[PDB]
Structures are given as C-alpha cells and as structure tokens.
C-alpha cells in the first residue's frame, strides 16, 4: 500500500509541477490561438483546405491529450489519497505520511469526491495520528478555500473528533485562534471573522461534553491574557521583584484539577483519558522583568508535584511565529532521529515549548540549568577573557572603539576590526576545560556542543534566523548543548534592520575554537552536509509544516491598508531547501562551504551591528 | 547598551 | 563460483589481477600456484613468464612468446646480445607460424600478432642502441619515433596497447637501472617520467585508475618533488579526480597553484603552460561541481589563466597556441553554460510569479506614496524589500549580459586562429542571433569577427541567409553586418 | 604502497581481502607468505587461524582467540567435547583479561571483545545442542533466539 501511494503521489506532482511549468502555459496559449483561429474559420464560409483540416485535427489530438492527462491525474490523486487512507487505517510503522496525505487533501478541497472518499473511508482513521498536524488543521477554517460546504463540515467534525480524543494539546491552540481581539476587549475581515466563528463553535461544542475543563482552562487563559497586558513600566527599576496586585485573577486561580500545565511537553497516549498527568496547584505571588522594552514577565508555577516550574509570559509580543519555529524544531528533530545516518550521529535540536495565548501575547517555557554565553565570555567582573587574557582588550574597550566607528567608512571600520581582532583572542575553548575534568566526559560534551551547533546553524540558515547575539544563545551547564531562546525575528528579517545581517548563522572566532583544533572541518562539516540531506530529502515535510501561513496571518504583516510577504518567505524557502536559489545548483557540500566562508569572512563581520558581538 | 538591534 | 575448469579459471583470475594493478599479489599467488600445484602447463607457464618479466622479477629462472621476451630482457640486462638476437628472431617466428596456421578470416585476430611484433621490434630497436653506447640525441629521436608511433596507435583498443606501454617502462626502468650518473641519466629520468605520464592519460581515456596510480607512484620513486613542481604534479591531481577522489584532487591542485603563483618568476614557458593548464583545469572542477559561485572563481583561475597565456605569446609555438585555445575555450564554454541558465531561470515560472509580486509591490508603495500616510516599520519594511529585489534583479542583468558579451569575444578569440573547435561556430550564431538587440555585441562581432575565416560558416549558411527579415528589429548595425558577411562568404564561395 | 612496514601491510592486506570476499585467493596468497616467510608472527598466525576456520580449512593444523576457535570447531567435528570445552573456557579467560589489562575509558574498544565473547557463547550453545541428539523444536527456538538477539544487533555496526 505504501508504495503503491507513494508512486501515485510521485506521479500526481510531476503532472502537477508540469503543468506549472511555463512549457505548459505556452501550450495552453498556442492552444487558445487555434480555438479562436478555428472560430474565426467557423464563423466566416471558408472552404475546408489542407492547412484548415491540419489544422483542427491537431486541435481535437490537443484536447484530447490535455483531457486524457487530466483524467490521469485525478484518478492518480484519488489511488494516492485511498492508498494513504487503507495505510492509515491499521497502520503504526508508517505514521510520518500523514503529512501527505493532508498535503493530498487540503491543497485539493475543490473536488467533491476526495472529500466524499475521505468522509467515507478515512473517517475512522484514529485521531492520535493528527496532533502533529493539528494546528494546520485548526487554520484551514477560512472560507477563502471555497470547495464546497462538504469539506468545511467534514473538516469541522475531525477536529471536534480530534479534541475530545485529546482535550490537552487541541483547546490551547482553538481558544488562542478565538482570542485575537481579546485584549482589546479586556482593555479583523470576513475571513478572521469565519475564523473566529468556526472557534467558537469549536469551544461550545467540546464544552458541551467537557464543561468544568474547558471553563477552567478559559479561565487560566484570561488569566494569563490580563497578566500579559498589566502595565509594569512603573517596575521598570526593581529587579529583586514585584508582588502581583490582588485584582488579577491569576492570584485567586489555584487547584486546578482538569488543568495540564501548557509550558511542559506531555506524552501522548493511545488512550482517551489522562489521570497521571502534572496539573496546576498554585502560583507565586512574586514576578520578574527580563529587561528590554517590551519587559516581558517571568513567574513560577507549582504544580501537583510540587516542582517549581518557571515561565515567561510576553505581553505585546506575537509568539505565533515563536510557535512555528518550535514546530518546524521538532519535526527537524523527528527526522532527523528517523534517518539512519544521523541517528547513529545522535543529531538532536533543543526545543522548549511555546504555547501562543492570543494575537499579541502568548507563553513560552523557562529554559533551566543554562547559562548565557555572553554573561560567560564577557562578563565584566568574572568574565572569561578577562581571567585568561588580562593583556587583551576589555569589553569595554572594544564597545567603545565600535561606537566610535560606526560613524566612519567601510575602511576604517573594517581596519577597527581587524586590529581588535588581533588584540582579542578567543577564550571559549576553555569551557568544557573548566566544566568537565574527565577526559571522556570532556570529549563527549564538546562532541555534543558541536554537533549541536552544526544542526542548530544549518537550520538557523534554512529558517533565516538573524537574531543571534550573545544574549539569544544559552549554553547548557551539563549537556553543553546551545538552546536558541529569543527567536524574535526570523525569516531574513535582518536585511530590514537598519544593520543588515551578512551572515546566515553566528560562526565567531570564539565557536570555533571551542569546537576544537580541526574548526570547522571535520565534525561541523560533515553534520552540516548531513542535515542539508535531510532537508533536502524531506523538503516536502518541512513546506507542509511552513505553509500554515496564508490563512491566519500574524501580527505586524498585512496592517495598513495569499499573502504578499508570507509568499515571499515562502519562495526564498523553497528556494533555499531546493539549492536554487537564481537558477543555479548547488551540492550540499557546495552550500556548506559556501556557507562556511560566508559565516567566517572578516569582510562581512564587519559590517555587523556592534551589539552583535561579532568578535566575540 | 542594549545587545539587540532594537526597530 | 567454483564451477568453471582450472584450466580457464586461474588464466582468467591471473588476466584479472592484471587488469587490476596488482603485481606482488598476483606474485604470491602464482607462488601459492607453483607449492600446489606441481607440473605447468604451457599457458599458466606461459602467464608466469609474462608476470616474470613484467614484474622484473629476475629471480626466477617451444618457449612462448612471454618466455622469448623475459629471455631477450635477461641477456639484454646481462649484456649477452648473440641470445638476445636469437631469441627474438625465434620468438618472431614463432608468432608468424602460430599466426598463418590457423584459418585466419578475421581482421581482429590480426591484432595481438601485431602488438606482439611491434613489441618485439621495439625491443630490436632499444637493442641496437644500447649495442654499443647511448646518446641524448639517439634517445630523444626514439622518443619522438615512440610518441609518433603512439599518435598512430590512438585509434586501436587498450588491450592491444597495454603490453606496448608495459614494455616500453621496463625498458626505461632497465635503462635506469644500467646508467652511470651523468646528464644522461637525467635525460632517461625525464623520458621516462613523460612516457609514464603519456601512458597516464591513455590509460585515463580507457576507464582506468589502477595503472596511471601506478604510473604516478613510479614517478614519485624516481622524481623528488621541489619548489617548482613539475607537470606530473597536475598528472597525479587529474588520475585522483578519476578515482571520485575529488577532494584531494582539488586541494592537490589548489597546493600546485599556490606555489606557482608565488614561485614562477618566468623560470620557463613549460611552467607557464602548465601553470595556464592548470588554472583551466581548476576553473572547470569549480565549475563542474559547483562548490563556490561563478563570479569569484570565473575571474580568479580562467581570466588569470588567459592573461597569463596571453602575455607571453611571443614564440607562436604549437604547445603554447594548444593551451591558449583549451583555455579560451573553457572560458566560452563556462560563460556559455551560465548565460543559458540565466536564460532559463528568467524563462521559468518561478521568475514570472517574483516579477507579479514585484510589481504588486511597486503598486502598492505608489499609492502608499500617492496618499499622506506616516511610515510605519510595515512601510519602511516594504521598501527596503522592494530596494533589495531591484538591485538583485538589476545586478543578474548585468551579469547575464556581462557572461553573454564574455562567450561571444571568447568564440571570436577562439575561432580566430583555431582549427580543431570549429564545431562550436553555430553556438557562436546561437549567442548572435538570438541576442541582435543588443548593440555592444554587434559592434565586437564587426570589430573583431570580421576577421574569422568564411569558410567555417558554410554549415550555417542557410541559417544567415534566413535572418534578413525585419521581424528581428535590433538596429540597422546588425542588418548590414550580417548583410556584408554574407556577401564576403559568396565571394569567397561561390559554389 | 611498499613504504608500509610488513608488519601491518599483510595484514591490512589481508582484511581488504577478507571484506572483499575473496577466501580461496586469500588461501592462496598465504601459502605464497608462508612459502617465502619462514617465521610466523602473532598477528599474520591469527590471521591464518581466522582464515582457517572462516574457510573450513580443515587440512592445515598462549593460543589467540581464532587459534582457540579454530580448535574447538575441530574438536566439535571430532566429536570431542572435553578438549573443546577447555579451548572455550581458555579463549574466554584469554579475552577477559586482556580486555581488562588495558586503560579501558573507551566504549568502541569493548564492542570486539563483547563480540567475540558472544560468538563463543553461540558456539557453547552449538555443543550443548549437539552434544547428545539434535531435534527439530531445539533448532527453532535456536533459530528464533539468534533473530531476536541479531534484531537486538540492529543499530550496532556491521564490523561487530
Ligand atoms: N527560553 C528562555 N529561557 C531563558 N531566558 C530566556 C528565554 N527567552 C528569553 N529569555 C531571556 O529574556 C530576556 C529578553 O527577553 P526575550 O524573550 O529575548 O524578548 P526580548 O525582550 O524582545 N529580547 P530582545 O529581542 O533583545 O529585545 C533575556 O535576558 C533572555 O536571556
Ligand atoms: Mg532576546
């Protein structure tokens, strides 16, 4: 049955990319020009000649191809989607098509019959199967896919069906698509509107079944959401910390019973109840600002166990696209743990969860037992460079001579550059050094951190993540493994800033030496060709992940008045996992090393913002 | 000073 | 598979071992062969003595041809000539009435008996001048007679050649091995190490690695590597790129540039080919492969490589006219290969949809213009998108035109003074015709092709006589050049 | 190559013959080390022990592990157990302790060692089934254990 689908789908898109192809649409032009030739022909008498009957009899072996062709490919459509169908039905082993399938079956919902076929046969597929794909599922309620009312109420009853199998990872994500408007009313087209109906309707509906859970959970999320947009600027100079003012509800919210912490990963079972699951107990009555200007808020949970748990609420911050990242993580992850080559190699990315709770607020996981690799490097009192290299430059220093510079040219920043390059040698070799005594645990954590750092810069490049200076990376005390916490702009979005970011992934002096005397030859290269092969070879997987966009757009896009930016980034994604880019191919061990001299070029350091820290 | 590079 | 008789099989496994490079394992198996198996018969003797005298294992002690040939090379290395001569005078005969006995009818049959004469003459040859004392001239013209012979040879199977290629190595190695230390020895060391490396690219050119690796070793046991590396360094580097070793080739021929580039000082012209030959050949590794853009190693290894070549044509030689026409061929056919994905990639359907998102950009920042509306970070955004996508697709103009203009004077210089890359003038029309609109390249065809020879064109005549239509509105410059060819052509040939 | 010393170039010769699945050839080339070469050293003996009994050379005649392997299959053709248990019991004693004499501190180091080990565990398995009579149920569930233990083997390497 697998591969028998696999072929059908196989064959499905090359018709589908050749009729995308321009070879088609100069087909289809020539093919108008004979239609209105042959009508003009028709409508004047004229007697039939050689050239005339040539010339309709090419005409009729056209349409007759075009219709041949397009018969074959919806019945190739229709064997894919039952083949996937039958695999699924009393399938474990091949669970990761189900992507496919969806793939299969959204992007077709104008045809009545696969919906039919679906609705029919796929419906007692189990709903344990979807959770990865759940959110997609959740953001295809817009009516811009007009494919008949039969979709939309099948598609519906799925994801009721879905919900009540698995309340705990499906009411998070309905009651935050239901809450885009709900901090201004705590303090908008046709389409968000459908949206917001079709949640609504959703919420009732599983409420019906579940009232004391989901009236408990709703009431944690106004909670959270009225927390997010409390006004701290008056705390603004206290760090110690602050006690939340009685009116919130949040202080009052305690012994949830039905309640699962949102911030902490829950492994999912084949059965439909949960009764050895972590639930919420009660709340700290104190709370942290993180710094920056939009001072995100930081807070303690305690939960059944009693285990502190702690996590960071980000008012005024829009984590859907926070929430992507993490989603797109954990299926680079899970395929790179189901790929042969790599899961001998151990290639893993570190992943926290992110849980959105409305368009402009939302709650993330507090990463434990890391340390900032800045606060490690250059910190002012203990720093790293200071305690080795009391003959380099300080910090200080260094953060001077950028400011003083950054008014000049492009020759004498790059001359700045390179004399504190040359005054400042890199320290960060020492970490393990001075974290892991053992030989054999020395070696492995550095493997580790290698490693991790390969998998985390080919996915950074291939996501377009540009934010990632020192404060953006925390480095664990144990697994030494980088954790990438900010995320906050992604999706070259550096080239916006008035700084632009000339490279794709943070590969300073300081990483480098850290990684060990061979650089980035040896470990880092040949993790980064085997992650460029992954993606290469499951581009399909990560282009469904990505392309939840075009239906629910996020904050900051679309604002003052098939998306045009989403689109965008869509392309240069395509672009970038297909090795095109302009027209031209490239190896994986080509982009590596093309990547490698990008990263590594003094020429492009240069031009960085100072606050990055390029030569840390 | 701040790290990031701020708008 | 066991199955198959001993008679045929360890024949089978010994020509196997052969073909395969392996010489001392082929030795020690035939010596597993001899303590097991106690009576010969007359083809694993025969095979014995031809791995015998191959080897130069001088060890072990009618006769068969290999029998004759190991027995004329041992009095040859003894300095017996009266049995050297005998034995080859009965070994020629032998294979004369081995050859006529049999029915014949077969041309392809024909051609181990040739090989084996050839050989036998060879080593008559090499006989008569070791007779009485040798001589850098003698030698040099039993090169060159050698080389001749091999040129006349390039048409013929491998098989038939190999044994030629064997022998001819012993004979340089035996001649090594017997030669007082003087410029003479340095000659035979340089006669060898090109012979080596000439049977290097044969063996290349027939889908094997094992001998030109053993070519390459043999080299580097007599040669010593200095400062200035000579021209079996890029042999070495282009037998590794045929092994899929293309990493180490690279780094090996990256090594040999860096220590041309720093250490030429014009020494000699045949470091300066071979430096131009070897910076083509990078170019189109990089080019093949693909492991760092166009713009960067265009201009660092195929510009360098024709400047270099062009500078220093003053003695017009055939080995110095050879490379500058690979290079400036390599060079047209790099800028050829990239201007046709340009063209492909703007043809595409993806192109298409960027150019629609474009101009929805250029739309929308119009009527966000047109209209008073304060710049907020999604305008300021948009903007800086629609700034970043004009100077890509301004720059990819500008470089499809600057790789079209580089193809067309490279053809030009090619098929200026060029005889054997006369196939290509049709992509010459190819990137001429199609492209008469623009006004640059029509003037460097009437400036410098105006010159090229008219009777490369007449393959192509039909297509110039068919562009005198209108519809191809480029100017009148292009109209009366091609006009003025065509006439220039008839007059040259009427017919 | 003829840099390499011969005391590692016959026996790298060897192994890539061995992986290219040339057994009579290797047979053959070790006759001809042999003719030539008088003295045997440890590691070329080992190796013509493994080739002995990897080939079923049954025709050539402390002791290493393949020496102590090639015995006991043997004496397990001689229907002899005695002899055989004892080269078992030696090859395992001789294995543990020269695993342990090392510094250890290296995990790859202890996959031959728990290799070999386990071959000689198969092979006590093999005598014990054979020692008296051998039935068809006794084959199976010997069977169905060994492809469980190789599903078991599944991630490790193909060397071991
Ligand atoms: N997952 C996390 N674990 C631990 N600390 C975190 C995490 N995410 C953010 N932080 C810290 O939060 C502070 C800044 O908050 P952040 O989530 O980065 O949003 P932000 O204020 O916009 N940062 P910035 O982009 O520089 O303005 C820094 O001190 C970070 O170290
Ligand atoms: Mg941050």
């Not at chain 1, 509107?193 to 079944?209: G, H, K, M, V, Y």
């Not at chain 1, 020192?470 to 664990?476: D, G, K, M, S």
């Not at chain 3, 949809?353 to 739309?363: P, Y």
């Amino acid at each position: 049955f697998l591969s028998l689908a696999r072929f059908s789908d196989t064959q499905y898109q090359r018709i589908e990319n050749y009729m995308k192809s321009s070879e088609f649409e100069n087909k289809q032009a020539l093919l108008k020009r004979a239609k209105e030739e042959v009508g003009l022909l028709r409508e004047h008498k004229i007697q039939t000649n050689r050239y005339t009957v040539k010339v309709q009899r090419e005409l009729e072996l056209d349409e007759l191809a075009l219709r041949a062709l397009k018969e074959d490919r919806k019945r190739f459509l229709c064997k894919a989607v039952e083949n996937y169908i039958n695999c699924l039905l009393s399938g474990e082993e091949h669970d990761m098509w189900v992507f496919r399938l969806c793939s299969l079956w959204l992007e077709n919902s104008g045809v009545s019959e696969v919906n039919g076929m679906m609705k029919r046969d796929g419906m007692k597929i189990p709903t344990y199967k979807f959770l990865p794909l759940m959110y997609q599922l959740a953001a295809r309620m817009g009516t811009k896919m007009m494919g008949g009312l039969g979709f939309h109420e099948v598609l519906n009853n799925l994801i009721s069906r879905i919900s009540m199998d698995h309340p705990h990872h499906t009411l998070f994500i309905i009651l935050a698509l239901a809450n885009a408007n709900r901090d201004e009313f705590l303090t908008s087209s046709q389409l968000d509107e459908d949206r917001t109906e079709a949640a609504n309707r959703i919420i009732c509906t599983i409420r019906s079944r579940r009232p004391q859970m989901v009236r408990s959970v709703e009431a944690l999320c106004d909670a959270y959401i009225i927390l997010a947009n409390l006004d701290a600027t008056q705390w603004k100079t206290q760090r110690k910390g602050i006690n939340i003012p009685a009116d919130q509800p949040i202080t009052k919210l305690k012994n949830l019973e039905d309640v699962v912490v949102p911030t902490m990963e829950i492994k999912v079972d084949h059965t439909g109840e949960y009764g050895n699951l972590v639930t919420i107990q009660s709340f700290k009555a104190e709370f942290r600002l993180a710094g920056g200007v939009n001072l995100p808020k930081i807070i303690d949970c305690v939960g059944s166990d009693g285990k502190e748990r702690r996590q960071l609420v980000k008012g005024r911050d829009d984590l859907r696209q926070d929430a992507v990242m993490q989603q797109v993580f954990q299926m680079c992850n899970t395929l790179l743990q189901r790929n042969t080559e790599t899961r001998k190699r151990k290639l893993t990315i570190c992943t926290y969860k992110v849980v959105p709770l409305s368009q402009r607020s939302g709650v993330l996981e507090w990463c434990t037992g890391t340390v900032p690799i800045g606060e490690f490097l250059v910190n002012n009192e203990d720093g790293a460079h200071k305690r080795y290299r009391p003959n380099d430059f300080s910090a200080f220093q260094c953060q001077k001579k950028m400011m003083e510079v950054q008014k000049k040219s492009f020759e004498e920043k790059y001359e700045v550059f390179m004399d504190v390059c040359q005054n400042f040698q890199p320290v960060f070799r020492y970490f393990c050094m001075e974290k892991f005594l053992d030989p054999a645990i020395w070696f492995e954590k550095r493997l580790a951190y290698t490693r991790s750092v390969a998998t985390s810069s080919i996915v950074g490049y291939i996501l377009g993540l540009g934010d990632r200076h020192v404060q953006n990376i925390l480095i664990n005390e144990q697994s030494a493994e980088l954790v990438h916490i900010d995320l906050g702009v992604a999706f070259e979005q550096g080239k916006i800033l008035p700084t632009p970011e000339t490279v794709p992934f943070r590969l300073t002096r300081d990483i480098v030496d850290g990684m060990g005397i061979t650089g980035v030859e040896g470990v880092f290269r040949r993790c980064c060709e085997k992650t460029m092969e992954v993606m290469r070879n499951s581009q399909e997987t990560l282009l469904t992940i990505v392309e939840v966009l075009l239906y629910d757009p996020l904050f900051d896009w679309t604002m003052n008045p098939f998306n045009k930016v989403a689109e965008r980034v869509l392309m240069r994604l395509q672009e970038k996992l297909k090795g095109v880019e302009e027209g031209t191919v490239l190896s994986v061990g080509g982009q590596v090393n093309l990547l490698i001299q990008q990263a590594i070029d003094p020429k492009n350091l240069s031009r960085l913002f100072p606050g990055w820290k390029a030569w840390v | 000073p701040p790290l990031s590079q701020e708008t | 598979e066991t199955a198959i008789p001993s008679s045929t099989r360890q024949a089978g496994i010994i020509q196997a071992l052969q073909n395969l490079g392996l010489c001392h394992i082929l030795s020690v198996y035939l010596k597993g062969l001899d303590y097991e198996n106690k009576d010969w018969c007359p083809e694993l003797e025969e095979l014995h003595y031809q791995a015998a005298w191959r080897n130069m294992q001088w060890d072990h002690c009618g006769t068969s041809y290999h029998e004759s040939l190991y027995n004329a090379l041992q009095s040859l290395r003894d300095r017996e000539f009266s049995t050297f001569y005998e034995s080859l005078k009965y070994a020629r005969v032998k294979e004369v009435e081995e050859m006529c006995k049999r029915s014949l009818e077969s041309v392809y049959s024909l051609y181990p008996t040739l090989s084996r004469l050839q050989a036998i003459g060879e080593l008559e040859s090499i006989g008569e001048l070791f007779s009485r004392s040798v001589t850098h001239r003698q030698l040099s013209e039993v090169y060159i007679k050698w080389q001749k012979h091999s040129q006349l040879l390039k048409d013929s199977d491998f098989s038939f050649q190999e044994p030629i290629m064997a022998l001819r190595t012993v004979i340089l190695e035996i001649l090594m091995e017997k030669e007082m230390d003087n410029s003479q020895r340095e000659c035979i060391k340089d006669i060898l190490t090109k012979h080596l490396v000439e049977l290097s690219i044969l063996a290349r050119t027939f889908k094997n690695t094992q001998l030109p690796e053993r070519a390459i070793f043999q080299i580097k046991q007599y040669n010593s590597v200095s400062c200035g590396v000579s021209e079996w360094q890029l042999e070495e580097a282009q037998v590794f790129w045929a092994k899929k070793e293309q990493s180490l080739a690279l780094s090996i021929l990256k090594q040999m540039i860096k220590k041309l580039d720093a250490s030429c000082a014009a020494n000699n012209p045949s470091l300066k080919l071979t430096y131009t030959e070897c910076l083509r050949v990078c170019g189109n590794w990089l080019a093949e492969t693909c492991l760092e853009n166009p713009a960067v190693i265009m201009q660092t290894y195929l510009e360098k490589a024709v400047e270099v070549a062009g500078n220093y044509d003053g003695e017009s030689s055939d080995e110095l006219r050879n490379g500058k026409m690979k290079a400036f061929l390599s060079l047209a056919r790099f800028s050829d290969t990239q201007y046709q994905r340009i063209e492909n990639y703007m043809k595409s359907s993806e192109f298409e949809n960027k150019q629609a998102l474009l101009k929805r950009a250029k739309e929308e920042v119009g009527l966000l213009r047109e209209h008073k509306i304060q710049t907020n970070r999604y305008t300021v955004k948009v903007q800086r998108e629609l700034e970043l996508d004009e100077l890509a697709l301004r720059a990819l103009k500008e470089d499809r035109k600057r790789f079209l203009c580089k193809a067309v004077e490279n053809y030009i210089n090619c098929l200026l003074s060029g005889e054997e890359h006369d196939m290509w003038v049709f992509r010459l029309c190819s990137l001429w015709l199609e492209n008469s609109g623009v006004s640059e390249v029509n003037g460097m065809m009437k400036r410098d092709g105006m010159k090229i020879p008219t009777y490369k064109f007449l393959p192509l005549m039909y297509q110039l006589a068919a562009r005198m239509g209108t519809k191809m509105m480029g100017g009148l410059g292009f109209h009366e050049v091609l006009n003025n060819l065509i006439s220039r052509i008839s007059m040259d040939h009427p017919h």
